[PDB]
Design a protein around this motif. Structure first.
Motif, PDB file in Angstrom:
ATOM      1  N   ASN A   1       0.817  -1.207   0.000  1.00 51.78           N
ATOM      2  CA  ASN A   1       0.000   0.000   0.000  1.00 51.78           C
ATOM      3  C   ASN A   1       0.852   1.259   0.000  1.00 51.78           C
ATOM      4  O   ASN A   1       0.468   2.270  -0.594  1.00 51.78           O
ATOM      5  N   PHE A   2       1.998   1.234   0.678  1.00 53.62           N
ATOM      6  CA  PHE A   2       2.816   2.437   0.735  1.00 53.62           C
ATOM      7  C   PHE A   2       3.584   2.674  -0.556  1.00 53.62           C
ATOM      8  O   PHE A   2       3.806   3.830  -0.923  1.00 53.62           O
ATOM      9  N   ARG A   3       3.977   1.616  -1.266  1.00 52.39           N
ATOM     10  CA  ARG A   3       4.597   1.809  -2.573  1.00 52.39           C
ATOM     11  C   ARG A   3       3.586   2.320  -3.591  1.00 52.39           C
ATOM     12  O   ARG A   3       3.925   3.143  -4.447  1.00 52.39           O
ATOM     13  N   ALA A   4       2.342   1.843  -3.519  1.00 52.35           N
ATOM     14  CA  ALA A   4       1.308   2.353  -4.411  1.00 52.35           C
ATOM     15  C   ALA A   4       1.017   3.826  -4.156  1.00 52.35           C
ATOM     16  O   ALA A   4       0.700   4.562  -5.093  1.00 52.35           O
ATOM     17  N   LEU A   5       1.119   4.274  -2.904  1.00 54.57           N
ATOM     18  CA  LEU A   5       0.873   5.680  -2.597  1.00 54.57           C
ATOM     19  C   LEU A   5       2.035   6.568  -3.039  1.00 54.57           C
ATOM     20  O   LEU A   5       1.817   7.703  -3.471  1.00 54.57           O
ATOM     21  N   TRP A   6       3.273   6.075  -2.940  1.00 54.01           N
ATOM     22  CA  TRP A   6       4.420   6.824  -3.450  1.00 54.01           C
ATOM     23  C   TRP A   6       4.321   7.030  -4.955  1.00 54.01           C
ATOM     24  O   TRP A   6       4.611   8.120  -5.458  1.00 54.01           O
ATOM     25  N   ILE A   7       3.902   5.996  -5.686  1.00 55.39           N
ATOM     26  CA  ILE A   7       3.846   6.073  -7.143  1.00 55.39           C
ATOM     27  C   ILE A   7       2.770   7.053  -7.591  1.00 55.39           C
ATOM     28  O   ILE A   7       2.947   7.784  -8.571  1.00 55.39           O
TER      29      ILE A   7
END
Ligand code: K
Ligand code: K
Ligand code: K
Ligand code: K
Ligand code: K
Ligand code: MG
Ligand code: MG
Ligand code: MG
Ligand code: MG
Ligand code: MG
Ligand code: MG
Ligand code: MG
Ligand code: MG
Ligand code: MG
Ligand code: MG
Ligand code: MG
Ligand code: MG
Ligand code: MG
Ligand code: MG
Ligand code: MG
Ligand code: MG
Ligand code: MG
Ligand code: MG
Ligand code: MG
Ligand code: MG
Ligand code: MG
Ligand code: MG
Ligand code: MG
Ligand code: MG
Ligand code: MG
Ligand code: MG
Ligand code: MG
Ligand code: MG
Ligand code: MG
Ligand code: MG
Ligand code: MG
Ligand code: MG
Ligand code: MG
Ligand code: MG
Ligand code: MG
Ligand code: MG
Ligand code: MG
Ligand code: MG
Ligand code: MG
Ligand code: MG
Ligand code: MG
Ligand code: MG
Ligand code: MG
Ligand code: MG
Ligand code: MG
Ligand code: MG
Ligand code: MG
Ligand code: NA
Ligand code: NA
Ligand code: NA
Ligand code: NA
Ligand code: ZN
Lengths: 48, 57, 113, 127, 123
Positions: free
Chosen positions: C55-61
């Motif tokens: 979830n945090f990598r998806a939010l960074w992208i």
RNA sequence: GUCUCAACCGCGAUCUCGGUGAAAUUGUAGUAUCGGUGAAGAUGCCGAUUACCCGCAACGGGACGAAAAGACCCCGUGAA
RNA sequence: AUAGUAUAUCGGUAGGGGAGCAUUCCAGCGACGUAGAAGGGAAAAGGGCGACUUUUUCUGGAGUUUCUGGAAAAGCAAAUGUAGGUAUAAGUAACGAUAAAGGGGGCGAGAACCCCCCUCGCCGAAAGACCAAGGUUUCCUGAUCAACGCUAAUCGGAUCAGGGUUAGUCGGGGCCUAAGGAUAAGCCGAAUGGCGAUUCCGAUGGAAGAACCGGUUAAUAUUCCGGUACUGAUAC
RNA sequence: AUUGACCGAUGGAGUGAGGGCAUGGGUGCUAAGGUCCAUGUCCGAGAGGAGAAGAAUCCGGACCACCGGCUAAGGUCCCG
RNA sequence: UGAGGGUAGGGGUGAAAGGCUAAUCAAACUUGGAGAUAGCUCGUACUCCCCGAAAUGCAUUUAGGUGCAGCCUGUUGGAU
RNA sequence: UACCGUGAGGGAAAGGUGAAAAGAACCUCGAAAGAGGAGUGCAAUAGACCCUGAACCCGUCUGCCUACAAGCGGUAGGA
RNA sequence: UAAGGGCAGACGGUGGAUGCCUAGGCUCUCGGAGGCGAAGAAGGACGUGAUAAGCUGCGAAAAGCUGCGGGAAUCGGCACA
């Protein structure tokens, strides 16, 4: 309706009383078992 | 016919929302000064609507 | 000798019931209900520790995509230009730069564009 | 060894500033009694006495005599007759007491249990 | 439905209800005021006022008509004696109902009904 | 008045208020609808749809509702 | 796990193997406790990991315990599992024949229900009166309303205390025998025992010994009192 | 070539109701989520990702932690 | 219809229904043998670590049981 | 033993104030039940069902949230 | 905002777990003994007190009567007043 217990004091003592228990060997065997247990009521002759 | 489940505490308490003791409709007696139920004779003095109704010994 | 562990047996239950405070209804204090609920929750936590990284990598992208698009570039083309130029800045750093230090982000874009 | 004496001394000094009365082991159901306690909670005592006197619930007569006691305890611990419009019911609670179990026959030889419940009532007053 | 059915059954059979109204009316004529419930007293008012109206025509027929209701010779003696003289000028409204409170055993609404011409404080 | 084809009347139950106060049942529940899916007939899964919070009366479609370790059927190197 | 830090390996049901924690008691070396032990509430911190441990503070008011070794009544979430307690359905069903109640007084803190009075209603080949069986003080009176009474209750077949049942004739028993039972002399039979008279016992029957009417107490009445009778013994 | 995977002796077992799919077949009707064999495989005893939601189809075998990176099957208009 | 007697469990009694024999009857009740037997169903409680199946063959008054083999695991010796 | 059964027979539940009864004179509210005080005592939140006094279950108060919202009620984020 | 509801804490109610304790059990060892009764037993009924339900003791001489040995200030059983 008529139920199973219809009391009669004459019948009760003739069937279960002290003198009927003492008249046979198997009745006296019952009296010995009840004495060894320490029963307070020995026969129906006691409750009277 | 039969409850499938026991009710939780919340469901029972939600139903009991409408279980309230009804307050009496009170008024002060212009003669005695005591509380009495509106539209009834004051049990203390016996008066009603400014007139004596139950002369109490 | 006769051995009964009354105090120990009861202490095991009391420790877990401290962990079930805050639950709804009987799930917080009734022993066999609460222990059932607590055990199910621990299974969620093992799975949700893994999904946190997703979830945090998806939010960074997503944040990098919005910042790049304000400078005439999509996420896929910007990332292709960074990896072509050897830049090894990770997505967590870039997203932070996109949001809170927009002037530094603009210098990374101006180096590959 | 004087520890419990020192714990109890502080407990008694605080009780001098609390004005209350108690009803213990009232032989009526706590849930019906609670219906009456919600009616007079936070209400001036002079108005509550009239409300309890003309209430249609039977539990009110018992509570009315307990409020009178609570007021009298207040005057004993304050050394003056209370004014009018001064005191009010600051706290009231009803707790379930011990239950008396009984038997009620049912058809076909079965027997069910009847609970005859009790309750405690505590009232606080305040100026 | 009960549209336009103007009498209270009072939770009793017809023969019971008629007997109670007749016993109650005798009690009101003999004792000038009685204490009863509100629903029973409002039903007595519709019953006893026409009976008190029959004492304005003092004849054998009026007494016998009244007696067919009360069937009590002491009530007839009082009704056509002192009660008749007190109400000789009032144009109806011989009785008054005043509410008093509630009973202990069933929380029934209570009241008293009385003859107006016997209550001096209310005149 | 069995029916066409029902209508009306009286009391007792019923409803409201005061007093007393059970039982069967019960893993936890903030327990909607439709189609799909699925141990192959879904309140609880998927996608949509509808729905302010809380009672009372009334009726029984569902909760494969409750009651009882299916009497049918088969099985046991069981029983009577 | 192998080699002595390196390489490999570490999803798991039935199942096999390894290493530990807690509990009760014992031996040994030792500690703690009214300047507060165990237990109970709250909080904080630890452990390759965990079963668990430690500390502080409130309650509590007298016992507790480290380590090494030893022995077990040595650990619960489910068995339509057991005991005790408390919930839910629910202030819901129901309060036990639809013969029925209304008013005025009374005692009383308190009355729909208790007492008195007037009216109303039900039974009347009975829902009235007298016995038997069975029950065993429930009978009358004073005090009491906690529990019991399907409501309340000043009332009760409830609690406590006091009081109350009087026979020459009544009913029994004393006498007699029936069905049946127990036996005598005898008979039968591993034992225990089974049978067996004109004998005895045994009424629901038979008696050659005889009483009825009235009145009095809060509670007994062919029993006490009045009147009028009868039947056995016994002495002159 | 191969982390060593094979065998003997001896202590302790559990299992002896299987199932889906692909291939070769019998049977059936070239029916069945049917039935009976053979060869693999997976579920059983296997989580993660795609397929909207599916025990065994496609990708892939979870020592623990991480708010690091690269990819598989499958995707890149929005819910996503 | 009242009172009192009598017949007792493979026994009694039955104007015969397998009816009745103390709310129990295709063999009463109580205690004992006794914790009968149950190839059946249900249940079996602290921790972490390593390994890890089978649902096949043969035989069986056998087919939802069991014996032996096959497949797991401990220890030990060999290389295969 | 109580209790159950015609009978043979079957067959429970139920321990603890305090060192010492010193077991609460007297007052206040109440018709009195109950309490508030006073006093005894190391302690009465040791007050007779009395050592300690847990859970399920039941109240009152305080803080935050809650009347456009739909699923095993948690878990990971987060004003 | 809260008719109501949720969660947390504080203080209580109910209930009687736990800790501590014992007045009673359980298994044995060593020694003795192994009966009572027609001179009426075992087991019971009814009685017995200043007061007296129930237990205990006792038997119309009835919580008891007479001697002998012991012992020394309290005593009229549980058990109060
Ligand atoms: K100990
Ligand atoms: K009386
Ligand atoms: K038999
Ligand atoms: K408590
Ligand atoms: K809103
Ligand atoms: Mg309601
Ligand atoms: Mg009550
Ligand atoms: Mg009232
Ligand atoms: Mg019956
Ligand atoms: Mg009606
Ligand atoms: Mg009601
Ligand atoms: Mg469907
Ligand atoms: Mg559906
Ligand atoms: Mg069903
Ligand atoms: Mg079955
Ligand atoms: Mg792995
Ligand atoms: Mg493993
Ligand atoms: Mg054990
Ligand atoms: Mg059940
Ligand atoms: Mg209902
Ligand atoms: Mg209803
Ligand atoms: Mg009923
Ligand atoms: Mg009803
Ligand atoms: Mg009735
Ligand atoms: Mg009669
Ligand atoms: Mg009487
Ligand atoms: Mg009552
Ligand atoms: Mg009496
Ligand atoms: Mg005679
Ligand atoms: Mg003879
Ligand atoms: Mg008499
Ligand atoms: Mg006479
Ligand atoms: Mg087999
Ligand atoms: Mg097979
Ligand atoms: Mg198949
Ligand atoms: Mg085929
Ligand atoms: Mg098949
Ligand atoms: Mg596999
Ligand atoms: Mg037949
Ligand atoms: Mg029968
Ligand atoms: Mg047989
Ligand atoms: Mg045997
Ligand atoms: Mg058995
Ligand atoms: Mg493995
Ligand atoms: Mg089989
Ligand atoms: Mg084998
Ligand atoms: Mg304390
Ligand atoms: Mg205590
Ligand atoms: Mg909207
Ligand atoms: Mg508590
Ligand atoms: Mg204990
Ligand atoms: Mg001497
Ligand atoms: Na302390
Ligand atoms: Na336990
Ligand atoms: Na609120
Ligand atoms: Na003598
Ligand atoms: Zn007034």
């Amino acid at each position: 309706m008529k139920r199973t217990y219809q009391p009669s004091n004459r019948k009760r003592l003739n069937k279960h009383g002290f003198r009927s228990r003492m008249a046979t060997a198997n009745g006296r065997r019952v009296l010995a078992a009840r004495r060894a247990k320490g029963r307070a009521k020995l026969t129906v002759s006691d409750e009277f | 016919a039969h409850p499938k489940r026991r009710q939780s505490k919340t469901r029972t308490a939600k139903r009991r929302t409408h279980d309230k003791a009804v307050m009496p409709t009170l008024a002060k007696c212009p003669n005695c000064g005591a509380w009495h139920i509106y539209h009834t004779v004051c049990g203390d003095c016996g008066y009603y609507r400014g007139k004596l109704a139950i002369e109490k010994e | 000798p006769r051995s009964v562990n009354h105090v120990a047996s009861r202490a095991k239950r009391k420790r877990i019931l401290k962990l079930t405070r805050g639950y709804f209804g009987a799930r917080k204090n009734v022993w066999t209900v609460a222990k059932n609920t607590w055990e199910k929750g621990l299974t969620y936590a093992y799975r949700d520790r893994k999904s946190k990284k997703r979830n945090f990598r998806a939010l960074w992208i997503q944040r990098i995509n919005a910042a790049a698009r304000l400078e005439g570039m999509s996420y896929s083309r910007l990332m292709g230009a960074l990896h072509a130029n050897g830049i090894e800045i990770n997505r967590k750093v870039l997203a932070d730069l996109a949001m809170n230090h927009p002037e530094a982000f603009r210098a990374i874009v101006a180096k590959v564009k | 060894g004087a520890r419990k004496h020192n714990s109890a001394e502080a407990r008694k000094e605080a009780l001098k500033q609390m004005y209350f009365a108690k009803l213990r082991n009232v032989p009526t159901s706590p849930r019906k009694m609670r219906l009456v306690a919600d009616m007079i909670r936070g209400m001036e005592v002079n108005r509550a006495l009239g409300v309890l006197k003309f209430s249609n619930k039977e539990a009110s007569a018992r509570v009315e005599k307990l409020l009178r006691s609570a007021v009298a305890n207040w005057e004993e611990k304050n050394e003056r007759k209370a004014e009018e419009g001064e005191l009010f019911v600051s706290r009231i609670c009803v707790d379930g007491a011990s239950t008396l179990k009984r038997l009620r026959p049912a058809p076909q030889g079965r027997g069910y249990r009847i609970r005859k419940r009790s309750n405690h009532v505590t009232i606080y007053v305040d100026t | 439905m009960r549209h336009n059915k103007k009498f209270n059954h009072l939770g009793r059979k017809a023969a019971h209800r008629k007997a109670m109204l007749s016993n109650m009316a005798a009690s009101l004529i003999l004792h000038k005021r009685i204490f009863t419930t509100v629903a029973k007293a409002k039903a007595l008012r519709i019953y006893v006022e026409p009976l008190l109206t029959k004492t304005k025509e003092d004849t054998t027929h009026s007494r016998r008509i009244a007696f067919s209701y009360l069937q009590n010779k002491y009530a007839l003696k009082e009704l056509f004696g002192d009660v008749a003289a007190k109400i000789a000028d009032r144009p109806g409204g011989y009785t008054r109902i005043l509410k008093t409170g509630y009973r202990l055993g069933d929380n029934a609404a209570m009241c008293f009904i009385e003859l107006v011409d016997y209550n001096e404080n209310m005149l």
